[PDB]
Design a protein around this motif. Structure first.
Motif, PDB file in Angstrom:
ATOM      1  N   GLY A  13       0.794  -1.227   0.000  1.00 38.09           N
ATOM      2  CA  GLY A  13       0.000   0.000   0.000  1.00 38.09           C
ATOM      3  C   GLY A  13       0.828   1.278   0.000  1.00 38.09           C
ATOM      4  O   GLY A  13       0.274   2.371  -0.158  1.00 38.09           O
ATOM      5  N   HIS A  14       2.132   1.160   0.169  1.00 34.79           N
ATOM      6  CA  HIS A  14       3.058   2.280   0.055  1.00 34.79           C
ATOM      7  C   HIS A  14       3.863   2.240  -1.228  1.00 34.79           C
ATOM      8  O   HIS A  14       4.069   3.283  -1.854  1.00 34.79           O
ATOM      9  CB  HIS A  14       4.007   2.284   1.258  1.00 34.79           C
ATOM     10  CG  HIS A  14       3.317   2.544   2.557  1.00 34.79           C
ATOM     11  ND1 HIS A  14       3.322   3.783   3.166  1.00 34.79           N
ATOM     12  CD2 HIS A  14       2.581   1.733   3.354  1.00 34.79           C
ATOM     13  CE1 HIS A  14       2.626   3.718   4.288  1.00 34.79           C
ATOM     14  NE2 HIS A  14       2.167   2.487   4.424  1.00 34.79           N
ATOM     15  N   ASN A  16       2.983   0.676  -4.114  1.00 33.01           N
ATOM     16  CA  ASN A  16       2.169   0.819  -5.321  1.00 33.01           C
ATOM     17  C   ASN A  16       1.872   2.268  -5.683  1.00 33.01           C
ATOM     18  O   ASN A  16       2.095   2.638  -6.847  1.00 33.01           O
ATOM     19  CB  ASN A  16       0.881  -0.001  -5.168  1.00 33.01           C
ATOM     20  CG  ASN A  16       1.117  -1.491  -5.303  1.00 33.01           C
ATOM     21  OD1 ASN A  16       2.200  -1.927  -5.685  1.00 33.01           O
ATOM     22  ND2 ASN A  16       0.074  -2.290  -5.044  1.00 33.01           N
ATOM     23  N   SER A 259      -3.217  -6.137   1.311  1.00 33.00           N
ATOM     24  CA  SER A 259      -1.949  -6.856   1.336  1.00 33.00           C
ATOM     25  C   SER A 259      -1.503  -7.273   2.732  1.00 33.00           C
ATOM     26  O   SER A 259      -0.545  -8.042   2.845  1.00 33.00           O
ATOM     27  CB  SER A 259      -0.843  -5.998   0.690  1.00 33.00           C
ATOM     28  OG  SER A 259      -0.510  -4.868   1.486  1.00 33.00           O
ATOM     29  N   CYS A 313      -4.707 -10.289  -7.507  1.00 41.57           N
ATOM     30  CA  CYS A 313      -5.327  -9.972  -8.784  1.00 41.57           C
ATOM     31  C   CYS A 313      -4.797  -8.640  -9.297  1.00 41.57           C
ATOM     32  O   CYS A 313      -4.103  -7.918  -8.580  1.00 41.57           O
ATOM     33  CB  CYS A 313      -6.860  -9.954  -8.634  1.00 41.57           C
ATOM     34  SG  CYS A 313      -7.537  -8.393  -7.982  1.00 41.57           S
ATOM     35  N   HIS A 330     -11.482  -3.725   2.808  1.00 44.88           N
ATOM     36  CA  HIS A 330     -11.048  -3.280   4.128  1.00 44.88           C
ATOM     37  C   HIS A 330     -10.850  -1.768   4.202  1.00 44.88           C
ATOM     38  O   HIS A 330     -10.535  -1.259   5.281  1.00 44.88           O
ATOM     39  CB  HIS A 330      -9.755  -4.004   4.532  1.00 44.88           C
ATOM     40  CG  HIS A 330      -8.522  -3.470   3.864  1.00 44.88           C
ATOM     41  ND1 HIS A 330      -8.424  -3.290   2.502  1.00 44.88           N
ATOM     42  CD2 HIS A 330      -7.329  -3.088   4.378  1.00 44.88           C
ATOM     43  CE1 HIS A 330      -7.232  -2.801   2.208  1.00 44.88           C
ATOM     44  NE2 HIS A 330      -6.549  -2.668   3.331  1.00 44.88           N
ATOM     45  N   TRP A 333      -6.487   2.979   1.852  1.00 43.84           N
ATOM     46  CA  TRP A 333      -6.715   4.181   1.062  1.00 43.84           C
ATOM     47  C   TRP A 333      -6.530   3.906  -0.417  1.00 43.84           C
ATOM     48  O   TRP A 333      -7.275   4.445  -1.240  1.00 43.84           O
ATOM     49  CB  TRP A 333      -5.799   5.334   1.504  1.00 43.84           C
ATOM     50  CG  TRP A 333      -5.994   6.550   0.603  1.00 43.84           C
ATOM     51  CD1 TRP A 333      -5.049   7.168  -0.170  1.00 43.84           C
ATOM     52  CD2 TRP A 333      -7.223   7.255   0.379  1.00 43.84           C
ATOM     53  NE1 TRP A 333      -5.618   8.218  -0.862  1.00 43.84           N
ATOM     54  CE2 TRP A 333      -6.950   8.293  -0.538  1.00 43.84           C
ATOM     55  CE3 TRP A 333      -8.528   7.108   0.866  1.00 43.84           C
ATOM     56  CZ2 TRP A 333      -7.931   9.183  -0.978  1.00 43.84           C
ATOM     57  CZ3 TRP A 333      -9.510   8.008   0.433  1.00 43.84           C
ATOM     58  CH2 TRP A 333      -9.203   9.027  -0.485  1.00 43.84           C
ATOM     59  N   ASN A 334      -5.560   3.061  -0.794  1.00 39.29           N
ATOM     60  CA  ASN A 334      -5.392   2.782  -2.218  1.00 39.29           C
ATOM     61  C   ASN A 334      -6.641   2.128  -2.802  1.00 39.29           C
ATOM     62  O   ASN A 334      -7.104   2.509  -3.878  1.00 39.29           O
ATOM     63  CB  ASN A 334      -4.175   1.904  -2.468  1.00 39.29           C
ATOM     64  CG  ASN A 334      -2.898   2.629  -2.178  1.00 39.29           C
ATOM     65  OD1 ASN A 334      -2.515   3.536  -2.921  1.00 39.29           O
ATOM     66  ND2 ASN A 334      -2.270   2.291  -1.070  1.00 39.29           N
ATOM     67  N   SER A 335      -7.187   1.131  -2.110  1.00 46.01           N
ATOM     68  CA  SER A 335      -8.399   0.470  -2.597  1.00 46.01           C
ATOM     69  C   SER A 335      -9.574   1.435  -2.626  1.00 46.01           C
ATOM     70  O   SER A 335     -10.408   1.402  -3.550  1.00 46.01           O
ATOM     71  CB  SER A 335      -8.718  -0.708  -1.687  1.00 46.01           C
ATOM     72  OG  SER A 335      -7.719  -1.692  -1.817  1.00 46.01           O
ATOM     73  N   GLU A 338      -8.882   3.907  -5.552  1.00 42.62           N
ATOM     74  CA  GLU A 338      -9.015   3.193  -6.821  1.00 42.62           C
ATOM     75  C   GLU A 338     -10.478   2.880  -7.129  1.00 42.62           C
ATOM     76  O   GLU A 338     -10.920   2.991  -8.279  1.00 42.62           O
ATOM     77  CB  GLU A 338      -8.171   1.916  -6.792  1.00 42.62           C
ATOM     78  CG  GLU A 338      -6.639   2.225  -6.853  1.00 42.62           C
ATOM     79  CD  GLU A 338      -5.740   1.103  -6.332  1.00 42.62           C
ATOM     80  OE1 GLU A 338      -6.218  -0.036  -6.137  1.00 42.62           O
ATOM     81  OE2 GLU A 338      -4.527   1.367  -6.120  1.00 42.62           O
ATOM     82  N   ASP A 354      -5.989   3.686   9.327  1.00 39.71           N
ATOM     83  CA  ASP A 354      -6.825   4.672   8.659  1.00 39.71           C
ATOM     84  C   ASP A 354      -8.078   4.057   8.037  1.00 39.71           C
ATOM     85  O   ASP A 354      -8.967   4.806   7.622  1.00 39.71           O
ATOM     86  CB  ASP A 354      -6.023   5.416   7.588  1.00 39.71           C
ATOM     87  CG  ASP A 354      -5.335   4.484   6.595  1.00 39.71           C
ATOM     88  OD1 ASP A 354      -4.605   3.567   7.022  1.00 39.71           O
ATOM     89  OD2 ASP A 354      -5.545   4.666   5.376  1.00 39.71           O
TER      90      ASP A 354
HETATM   91  O1  LIG Z   1      -5.415  -8.602  -5.322  1.00 36.21           O
HETATM   92  C1  LIG Z   1      -4.913  -7.318  -5.135  1.00 36.21           C
HETATM   93  C2  LIG Z   1      -5.191  -6.618  -3.964  1.00 36.21           C
HETATM   94  C3  LIG Z   1      -4.651  -5.349  -3.837  1.00 36.21           C
HETATM   95  N1  LIG Z   1      -3.897  -4.849  -4.814  1.00 36.21           N
HETATM   96  C4  LIG Z   1      -3.325  -3.516  -4.634  1.00 36.21           C
HETATM   97  O2  LIG Z   1      -2.739  -3.595  -3.142  1.00 36.21           O
HETATM   98  C5  LIG Z   1      -2.707  -2.384  -2.682  1.00 36.21           C
HETATM   99  C6  LIG Z   1      -3.537  -2.330  -1.352  1.00 36.21           C
HETATM  100  O3  LIG Z   1      -3.345  -1.061  -0.773  1.00 36.21           O
HETATM  101  P1  LIG Z   1      -4.449  -0.540   0.337  1.00 36.21           P
HETATM  102  O4  LIG Z   1      -5.850  -0.629  -0.213  1.00 36.21           O
HETATM  103  O5  LIG Z   1      -4.051   0.889   0.637  1.00 36.21           O
HETATM  104  O6  LIG Z   1      -4.427  -1.523   1.641  1.00 36.21           O
HETATM  105  P2  LIG Z   1      -3.126  -2.184   2.422  1.00 36.21           P
HETATM  106  O7  LIG Z   1      -2.672  -3.393   1.659  1.00 36.21           O
HETATM  107  O8  LIG Z   1      -3.669  -2.589   3.773  1.00 36.21           O
HETATM  108  O9  LIG Z   1      -1.908  -1.056   2.553  1.00 36.21           O
HETATM  109  C7  LIG Z   1      -2.098   0.172   3.190  1.00 36.21           C
HETATM  110  O10 LIG Z   1      -3.109   0.182   4.269  1.00 36.21           O
HETATM  111  C8  LIG Z   1      -3.388   1.606   4.565  1.00 36.21           C
HETATM  112  C9  LIG Z   1      -4.006   2.197   3.347  1.00 36.21           C
HETATM  113  O11 LIG Z   1      -4.359   3.494   3.706  1.00 36.21           O
HETATM  114  C10 LIG Z   1      -2.164   2.520   4.793  1.00 36.21           C
HETATM  115  O12 LIG Z   1      -1.826   2.537   6.194  1.00 36.21           O
HETATM  116  C11 LIG Z   1      -0.962   2.175   3.984  1.00 36.21           C
HETATM  117  O13 LIG Z   1      -1.012   2.863   2.665  1.00 36.21           O
HETATM  118  C12 LIG Z   1      -0.786   0.727   3.778  1.00 36.21           C
HETATM  119  O14 LIG Z   1      -0.460   0.085   5.051  1.00 36.21           O
HETATM  120  C13 LIG Z   1      -3.422  -1.481  -3.735  1.00 36.21           C
HETATM  121  O15 LIG Z   1      -2.491  -0.810  -4.490  1.00 36.21           O
HETATM  122  C14 LIG Z   1      -4.176  -2.522  -4.554  1.00 36.21           C
HETATM  123  O16 LIG Z   1      -4.493  -1.973  -5.918  1.00 36.21           O
HETATM  124  C15 LIG Z   1      -3.676  -5.569  -5.890  1.00 36.21           C
HETATM  125  O17 LIG Z   1      -2.930  -5.055  -6.902  1.00 36.21           O
HETATM  126  N2  LIG Z   1      -4.157  -6.796  -6.078  1.00 36.21           N
END
Ligand SMILES: O=c1ccn([C@@H]2O[C@H](COP(=O)(O)OP(=O)(O)O[C@H]3O[C@H](CO)[C@@H](O)[C@H](O)[C@H]3O)[C@@H](O)[C@H]2O)c(=O)[nH]1
Length: 432
Positions: A13-14, A16, A259, A313, A330, A333-335, A338, A354
Motif C-alpha cells: 500500500g506504500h 504501489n 496486502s 489480482c 477493508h 486508502w489505495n483500494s 481506486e 486509517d
Molecule cells: O489482489 C490485489 C489486492 C490489492 N492490490 C493492490 O494492493 C494495494 C492495497 O493497498 P491498500 O488498499 O491501501 O491496503 P493495504 O494493503 O492494507 O496497505 C495500506 O493500508 C493503509 C491504506 O491506507 C495505509 O496505512 C498504507 O497505505 C498501507 O499500510 C493497492 O495498491 C491494490 O491496488 C492488488 O494489486 N491486487
C-alpha cells in the motif's frame, strides 16, 4: 535526464502508489531509481517493462520465515521500527553514495511520509526531498492534530465530519504496539516545514476544505490518483481477466482485504457463507498465506459455481471491469481511491489504522458505500444485507451514481488542466 530516487515504505500500500507516480514521471522523461528492501525484492516478479532501476537495501530487521516486513515489525514495533530506521538511514546513504558514481546524478528523493527522517539523508546528500503521503488529506490531518496535541489516540476536528470513536484511526487494534504506531503516524508532520515538496495521493475535489486548510499552512501538491485511471508483483492477470470477461455487466462482487490485513478463521467462515448464500458471482483475493484459514472445501469445490478465489489480482484492471458491481473492501486508502476513481461502490469492512476513518468518509461524506456492523465478529447475515443494499436496493443505485460522479471528477483531476495534472506539472517544472 533528471534523476529521481523513490523510497516507499516496504509494504504494498506504500510501494504501489509511489510506483504509479514514478511511472508518470518516467513518461515525462525523468530517470527513476526505486529503492526497495531485500524482502520486497523477493516478491518482485516483473520490472523490465517499466524501465525503472531497482536498487535494494537490507531489511534492517530480522527475517522470520517468509513473512512480510510489517509482520516481523509487529512483533515489537517500537524496537523494530527504530532498527528499520537506523538501517535505512545508513543504507540509503551508502546507496546514494554509489549512485553518485553514475550519470545521471540523483537530484531528488521522494520518500514515504512515514519515514520523515529520510529528509535529513536527502539534504545531507545534496538532494531535494519530497514527502509522499499515501493517505488522504482528511486522515493525515488527524495525525497532524495528534502531533500538535489537539487530540490523543463524539470527536470534532476542523473540516472533518463529526466522528464516533470507532471512526478514529484504529491504533488500539495494535495492542502493545498502539503507542508506537500513534507516535509514528504523528511524526509524519514533525519536519513538514523543512520538506522541499509535500505530495498527497488525493485530488482537490475529493476533500476541498481540508486541502484548502492544509494549503493555508504549507504549499502542498495533490497529485492523485497516481494510479493509471502497472504491477511489480504477481497479479494472475490472465486467469482473472478471462473469468471477468465471462461475467455480465454489474454482477460480480470483488472482495479484498488488501496486502496485510488477516481475518480469523471465524471471520473467514462468515465471509465465505455470506458470499455463497448471496447468489452473486464473486472474485475474492485470499492471499496465499491466508488460504489455510478458508473453510475446508471452499476454494476447490463450494466456490467453483460462482466464485474465483485467487491469491492476488490486477486490482486496477479488476475495478475497471464492467462486470464488477461492488467492492467488499477493508478500506485501505489505495483500494478506496481506486474504487472511487473507477466508479465502484463499496461494502466497508475496515480493520485498523486509517481504514476505520476511510470507511466513515466512504459512507457518510462521499456516499459511495455502506459499512458492515460488527456484533466483535461481522456475521454472514450482516454481510448479506449489505450485499442486497448495494446490488438490489434503490440505495445501491444511488451509491453507484455517486461513484460515477466521483469517477468523472477524478478523470478531470488527472486530465490536462486538472488539479492533479497541474500539480504534477508544477512539481516536474520545479525540478527543471
Ligand atoms: O489482489 C490485489 C489486492 C490489492 N492490490 C493492490 O494492493 C494495494 C492495497 O493497498 P491498500 O488498499 O491501501 O491496503 P493495504 O494493503 O492494507 O496497505 C495500506 O493500508 C493503509 C491504506 O491506507 C495505509 O496505512 C498504507 O497505505 C498501507 O499500510 C493497492 O495498491 C491494490 O491496488 C492488488 O494489486 N491486487
Amino acid at each position: 535526464p533528471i534523476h529521481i530516487l523513490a523510497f516507499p515504505f516496504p509494504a504494498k500500500g506504500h510501494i504501489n502508489p509511489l510506483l504509479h507516480l514514478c511511472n508518470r514521471l518516467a513518461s515525462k522523461g525523468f530517470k527513476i531509481t526505486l529503492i526497495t528492501t531485500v524482502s520486497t525484492l523477493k516478491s518482485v516478479k516483473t520490472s523490465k517493462a517499466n524501465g525503472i532501476d531497482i536498487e535494494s537495501i537490507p531489511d534492517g530487521i530480522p527475517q522470520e520465515q517468509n513473512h512480510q516486513i510489517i509482520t516481523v515489525m509487529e512483533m515489537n514495533m517500537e524496537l523494530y521500527f527504530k532498527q528499520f530506521k537506523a538501517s535505512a538511514i545508513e543504507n540509503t546513504t551508502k546507496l546514494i553514495q554509489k549512485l553518485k558514481t553514475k550519470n545521471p546524478l540523483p537530484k531528488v528523493l521522494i520518500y514515504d511520509s512515514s519515514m520523515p527522517w529520510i529528509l535529513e539523508v536527502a539534504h545531507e546528500q545534496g538532494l531535494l526531498g519530497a514527502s509522499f503521503f499515501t493517505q488522504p488529506c482528511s486522515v493525515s490531518a488527524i495525525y497532524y492534530h495528534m502531533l500538535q496535541g489537539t487530540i490523543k489516540l463524539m470527536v470534532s476536528l476542523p473540516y472533518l465530519p463529526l466522528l464516533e470513536i470507532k471512526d478514529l484511526p484504529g491504533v488500539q487494534q495494535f495492542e502493545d504496539n498502539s503507542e508506537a504506531v500513534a507516535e509514528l503516524l504523528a511524526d509524519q508532520f514533525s519536519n513538514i516545514d523543512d520538506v522541499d515538496y509535500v505530495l498527497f495521493n488525493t485530488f482537490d475535489a475529493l476533500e476541498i476544505e481540508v486541502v484548502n486548510w492544509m494549503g493555508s499552512k504549507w504549499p502542498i501538491l495533490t497529485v492523485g490518483p497516481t494510479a493509471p485511471t502497472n504491477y511489480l508483483f504477481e497479479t494472475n492477470t490472465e486467469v482473472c481477466m478471462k473469468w471477468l470477461d465471462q461475467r455480465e455487466i454489474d454482477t460480480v462482487i470483488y472482495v479484498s482485504f488488501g496486502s496485510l490485513a488477516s481475518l480469523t478463521e471465524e471471520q473467514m467462515e462468515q465471509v465465505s457463507q455470506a458470499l455463497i448464500r448471496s447468489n452473486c458471482y464473486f472474485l475474492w483475493v485470499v492471499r496465499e498465506e491466508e488460504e489455510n484459514k478458508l473453510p475446508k472445501d471452499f476454494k476447490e469445490t463450494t466456490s467453483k459455481k460462482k466464485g474465483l478465489v485467487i491469491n492476488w489480482c490486477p486490482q486496477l484492471d479488476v475495478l475497471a471491469h464492467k462486470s464488477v458491481a461492488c467492492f467488499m473492501t477493508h478500506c485501505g486508502w489505495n483500494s478506496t481511491l481506486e474504487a472511487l476513481c473507477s466508479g465502484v461502490p463499496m461494502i466497508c469492512m475496515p480493520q485498523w489504522a486509517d481504514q476505520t476513518t476511510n470507511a466513515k468518509l466512504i459512507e457518510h461524506v462521499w456516499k459511495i458505500g455502506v459499512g458492515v456492523n460488527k456484533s466483535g465478529i461481522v456475521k454472514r447475515e450482516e454481510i448479506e444485507d449489505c450485499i442486497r443494499q448495494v446490488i438490489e436496493s434503490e440505495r445501491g443505485k444511488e451509491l453507484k451514481r455517486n461513484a460515477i460522479k466521483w469517477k468523472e471528477l477524478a478523470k478531470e483531476a488527472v486530465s490536462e488542466g486538472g488539479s492533479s495534472c497541474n500539480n504534477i506539472q508544477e512539481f516536474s517544472s520545479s525540478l527543471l
